[PDB]
Amino acid sequence: GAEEAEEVGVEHLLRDIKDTTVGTLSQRITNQVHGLKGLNSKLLDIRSYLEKVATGKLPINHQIIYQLQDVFNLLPDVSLQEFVKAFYLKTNDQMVVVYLASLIRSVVALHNLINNKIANRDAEKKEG
Amino acid sequence: NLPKARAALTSARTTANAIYCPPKLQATLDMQSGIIHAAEEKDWKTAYSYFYEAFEGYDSIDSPKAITSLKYMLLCKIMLNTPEDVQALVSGKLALRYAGRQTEALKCVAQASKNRSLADFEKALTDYRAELRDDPIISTHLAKLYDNLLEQNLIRVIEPFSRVQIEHISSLIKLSKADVERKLSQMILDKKFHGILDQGEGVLIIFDEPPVDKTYEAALETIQNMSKVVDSLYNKAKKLT
Amino acid sequence: YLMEGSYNKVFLAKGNIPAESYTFFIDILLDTIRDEIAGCIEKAYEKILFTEATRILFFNTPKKMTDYAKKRGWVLGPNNYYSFASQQQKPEDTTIPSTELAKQVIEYARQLEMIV
Amino acid sequence: TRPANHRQLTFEEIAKSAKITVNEVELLVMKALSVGLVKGSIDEVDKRVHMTWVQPRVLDLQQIKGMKDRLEFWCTDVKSMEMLVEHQAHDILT
């Protein structure tokens, strides 16, 4: 945890780093760290659930392995796990994101396009 | 006759403003001020105040002329939103003061059409054939009560549960196709009732979701944006030529 | 009149269609009748019966329409005809339209990046 | 035992193998509602005993070994498709 101000030293001693306005690659940094750094921890969990099958004594199945094989049994299923509720539920999801991107990025088309043209041709033919 | 009583209004506000001691016909003009001005809907109750000073100007008046000089104001208390005529006036001493009879039918119809189980208007429509009287002269004083009580009954039967086929919900009116379909479709038109009826299966279904300001607000704002871009196209055509 | 909708204007035309050996080509015209029947015998149809194979097809019954009952994967019903038991072979195609659209979100969201 | 879908199960294996009748399957879950290990949303227009989250088992050491087709499946498939996203989102490294 970080308590108080203390960055008269610290954030002067940054001398490298930028506050990213997330949506500017910081998300893919988190993608590498949770995907990679989560799934190598999953490889530690196949070290668990392979080495304990191999050489693991009494905490092989003490009291939390099957108990959190429940939590593993949230959604581990076989072929494609068949989330049939989640696909028109996903129409209710991607509903929102594509409607906002559609209408709102047409507003962004006004944002970029319109005054891009105005200041464009002011800078262009008002140069003469 | 609102045009003819409008001519009586204009001759009343200045012709009868000049007669010095007309106390009897003054309360008659007050009955005109209750009748015509609730008929213009000046106010729901100040017109009744004109009936109500009109009322106390109806002493030393002839007793058949007296008892017809009260029907419009007891009938105004019938036309007093909440049918509260029973509890105050006709179980009160006034109808038990004079030789009124029709008002004593106004007791039972003002009470059984307080019970909200109908049983009353259809039954005593014959009992009110004398009280309907001039078919085209009142036309309102029972039609607003009962033609309110239509959709009052509709919000007793259709309000508690939305979807229903058309005949069993209309089993409490026992016509299935005459006017209850037109009344309910009128309530679709009047937005008290957001549903869709049916005839092929005859299955009424109620559901609604109007508001999407995501579509409405953004879309109409962008139409306004199109107007302001059109407002910019003359800065464009101006900087061209 | 072919593309108007008359396969019998064929047989009205073939009354005088020799036309200096325009016989091979009207035989291949009979071919482009019959294989289009092999398309259009049950295209969006319920079913037909034998007399429709007497009308649209001709030559009553060869082993060519018996071949048509035994070439295309055909249900020769008892004086009855079916393309299949369903004629359309159960169209759902994905039963999941969403995840490939998330691949559209992959490259499309990438396209939203690199530009401004 | 079947991990996959058709979790809105009909009562047929319930009325067959669990030696119960059709009128009691509701009690068989409502008492299970008082139990609280499984909390299914049982259909009653089709009498379908729906499967939600459960307390699954106690030990399947053959599936403590044989969990690889879910665990390593998860590992290299969320990691591999992770690298399919990051391989698509590659030259926006910027």
Side-chain angles (χ1 to χ4, degrees):
Chain A
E3 187 197 3
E4 285 299 324
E6 79 189 4
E7 287 165 351
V8 169
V10 171
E11 285 179 353
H12 183 72
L13 284 165
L14 295 174
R15 298 334 120 231
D16 186 74
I17 203 65
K18 180 187 183 294
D19 183 75
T20 64
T21 62
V22 177
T24 150
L25 141 78
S26 174
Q27 64 278 15
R28 65 95 53 85
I29 295 165
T30 65
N31 284 122
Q32 292 180 356
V33 180
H34 71 259
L36 193 146
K37 300 295 191 293
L39 290 166
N40 59 6
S41 177
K42 186 64 71 179
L43 190 144
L44 268 60
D45 298 328
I46 206 162
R47 176 62 65 195
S48 77
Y49 292 159
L50 181 60
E51 194 273 334
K52 293 293 182 177
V53 181
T55 59
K57 291 184 71 67
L58 296 169
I60 177 172
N61 197 13
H62 182 62
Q63 93 314 355
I64 204 63
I65 305 302
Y66 68 101
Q67 189 177 2
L68 219 141
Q69 193 177 5
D70 193 355
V71 195
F72 181 76
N73 203 0
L74 263 67
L75 46 99
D77 293 337
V78 275
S79 67
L80 294 172
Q81 304 190 358
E82 293 179 354
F83 288 165
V84 181
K85 304 291 186 290
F87 303 127
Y88 63 94
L89 184 153
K90 185 70 175 178
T91 306
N92 193 10
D93 300 341
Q94 200 66 252
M95 185 78 186
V96 176
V97 170
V98 183
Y99 286 164
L100 292 174
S102 62
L103 283 77
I104 275 84
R105 288 295 190 267
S106 64
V107 179
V108 174
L110 179 130
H111 277 94
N112 286 318
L113 282 170
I114 300 304
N115 287 318
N116 197 354
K117 291 177 180 67
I118 291 172
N120 192 8
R121 292 174 293 174
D122 289 330
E124 191 271 333
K125 81 178 293 185
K126 295 300 290 183
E127 187 175 1
Chain B
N1 196 1
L2 185 143
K4 187 184 285 186
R6 180 68 69 88
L9 175 62
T10 304
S11 69
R13 297 295 298 273
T14 180
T15 302
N17 204 3
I19 291 98
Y20 294 148
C21 293
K24 291 174 70 174
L25 298 176
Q26 184 61 43
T28 303
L29 187 146
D30 291 331
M31 183 180 283
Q32 292 179 358
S33 301
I35 285 292
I36 286 93
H37 292 85
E40 287 286 326
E41 294 174 354
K42 182 71 172 64
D43 188 78
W44 188 257
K45 193 173 89 276
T46 72
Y48 179 69
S49 176
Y50 292 123
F51 289 118
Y52 185 68
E53 185 69 27
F55 175 71
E56 293 292 329
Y58 294 153
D59 297 333
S60 298
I61 188 66
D62 186 70
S63 177
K65 295 299 292 181
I67 198 67
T68 188
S69 299
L70 269 68
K71 297 297 180 71
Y72 296 101
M73 60 193 70
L74 308 178
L75 183 145
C76 180
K77 186 161 264 81
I78 299 299
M79 193 181 176
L80 23 43
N81 309 75
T82 332
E84 185 60 25
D85 199 5
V86 177
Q87 187 168 355
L89 263 63
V90 295
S91 297
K93 74 176 183 292
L94 178 61
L96 305 174
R97 184 63 183 85
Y98 296 103
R101 174 73 269 168
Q102 296 180 355
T103 183
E104 298 178 354
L106 292 168
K107 297 181 70 66
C108 66
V109 187
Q111 183 54 253
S113 65
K114 182 68 177 178
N115 292 324
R116 304 277 74 81
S117 325
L118 225 240
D120 192 3
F121 178 74
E122 184 67 30
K123 180 176 71 67
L125 181 61
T126 305
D127 291 330
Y128 280 176
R129 183 59 183 86
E131 287 81 348
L132 213 197
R133 319 299 60 164
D134 285 17
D135 281 72
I137 282 176
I138 40 163
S139 173
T140 300
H141 308 84
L142 299 175
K144 301 301 182 292
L145 187 144
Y146 182 70
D147 293 330
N148 191 7
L149 181 50
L150 269 73
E151 66 270 18
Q152 289 304 109
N153 290 316
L154 300 178
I155 62 94
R156 288 182 179 89
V157 296
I158 308 167
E159 181 178 359
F161 62 98
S162 77
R163 58 184 68 191
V164 60
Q165 72 279 34
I166 60 170
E167 67 276 14
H168 294 83
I169 192 68
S170 71
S171 293
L172 278 82
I173 198 60
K174 298 174 288 297
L175 61 92
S176 292
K177 275 81 176 174
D179 55 359
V180 172
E181 295 182 354
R182 293 185 292 112
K183 179 67 176 178
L184 266 64
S185 67
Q186 185 178 2
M187 297 305 107
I188 295 171
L189 295 174
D190 301 330
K191 298 297 181 181
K192 301 294 182 68
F193 175 78
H194 298 170
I196 187 71
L197 288 76
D198 187 274
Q199 190 176 2
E201 296 294 324
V203 175
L204 166 64
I205 293 169
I206 285 96
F207 61 97
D208 50 346
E209 182 65 30
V212 184
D213 56 347
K214 178 177 70 67
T215 300
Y216 296 159
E217 180 182 0
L220 295 171
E221 276 181 356
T222 51
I223 296 169
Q224 298 183 0
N225 281 119
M226 292 298 168
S227 68
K228 296 167 180 65
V229 165
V230 169
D231 295 329
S232 69
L233 304 183
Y234 294 97
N235 293 317
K236 295 181 180 68
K238 180 176 285 193
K239 73 178 75 174
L240 290 170
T241 183
Chain C
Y1 292 156
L2 267 70
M3 290 180 180
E4 186 66 30
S6 181
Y7 291 97
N8 294 317
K9 185 59 181 176
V10 170
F11 288 163
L12 296 173
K14 287 172 95 289
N16 190 6
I17 324 260
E20 100 231 325
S21 328
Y22 268 18
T23 305
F24 294 101
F25 298 115
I26 64 175
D27 288 331
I28 305 163
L29 195 156
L30 291 175
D31 193 7
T32 197
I33 291 171
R34 297 299 176 91
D35 59 3
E36 292 296 323
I37 298 171
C40 299
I41 197 65
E42 289 186 1
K43 180 68 179 178
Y45 288 172
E46 302 294 326
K47 62 187 179 295
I48 66 164
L49 192 138
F50 180 74
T51 178
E52 287 83 3
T54 313
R55 290 179 180 88
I56 291 95
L57 292 170
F58 298 92
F59 326 108
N60 38 77
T61 303
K63 299 296 186 291
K64 180 177 71 176
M65 70 167 284
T66 308
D67 195 6
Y68 290 159
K70 274 81 178 175
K71 185 176 180 180
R72 70 188 75 192
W74 187 260
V75 179
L76 180 62
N79 196 358
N80 196 357
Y81 287 95
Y82 293 105
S83 176
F84 296 101
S86 177
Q87 194 271 124
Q88 190 61 37
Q89 297 177 356
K90 187 63 178 176
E92 69 273 10
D93 301 331
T94 16
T95 74
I96 302 97
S98 64
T99 63
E100 59 184 359
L101 292 178
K103 272 75 177 178
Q104 299 301 114
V105 178
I106 296 169
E107 63 259 4
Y108 183 78
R110 180 176 175 85
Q111 288 169 353
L112 302 175
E113 190 58 30
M114 194 183 292
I115 65 168
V116 65
Chain D
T1 307
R2 290 178 290 111
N5 210 359
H6 298 167
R7 295 179 63 86
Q8 190 188 0
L9 280 173
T10 183
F11 63 96
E12 183 178 2
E13 191 269 329
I14 293 96
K16 179 185 290 184
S17 300
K19 63 185 289 184
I20 204 65
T21 186
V22 184
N23 291 318
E24 290 295 324
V25 298
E26 298 86 2
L27 282 83
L28 186 148
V29 293
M30 284 182 290
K31 182 68 176 177
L33 290 179
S34 65
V35 174
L37 59 91
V38 65
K39 292 177 287 298
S41 66
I42 288 93
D43 188 358
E44 287 168 342
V45 77
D46 295 329
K47 293 185 284 186
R48 292 183 182 273
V49 183
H50 179 75
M51 297 295 106
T52 63
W53 176 71
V54 77
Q55 184 64 253
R57 290 297 184 192
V58 176
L59 176 59
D60 292 326
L61 193 146
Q62 62 184 358
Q63 294 178 356
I64 302 303
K65 185 260 293 179
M67 54 89 221
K68 292 176 95 288
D69 291 332
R70 306 174 188 276
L71 197 83
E72 194 274 335
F73 181 83
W74 183 262
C75 179
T76 194
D77 286 332
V78 180
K79 186 180 181 294
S80 67
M81 292 176 184
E82 179 71 31
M83 293 304 296
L84 292 176
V85 175
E86 293 177 353
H87 186 270
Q88 185 62 255
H90 190 271
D91 295 331
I92 56 173
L93 191 147
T94 307

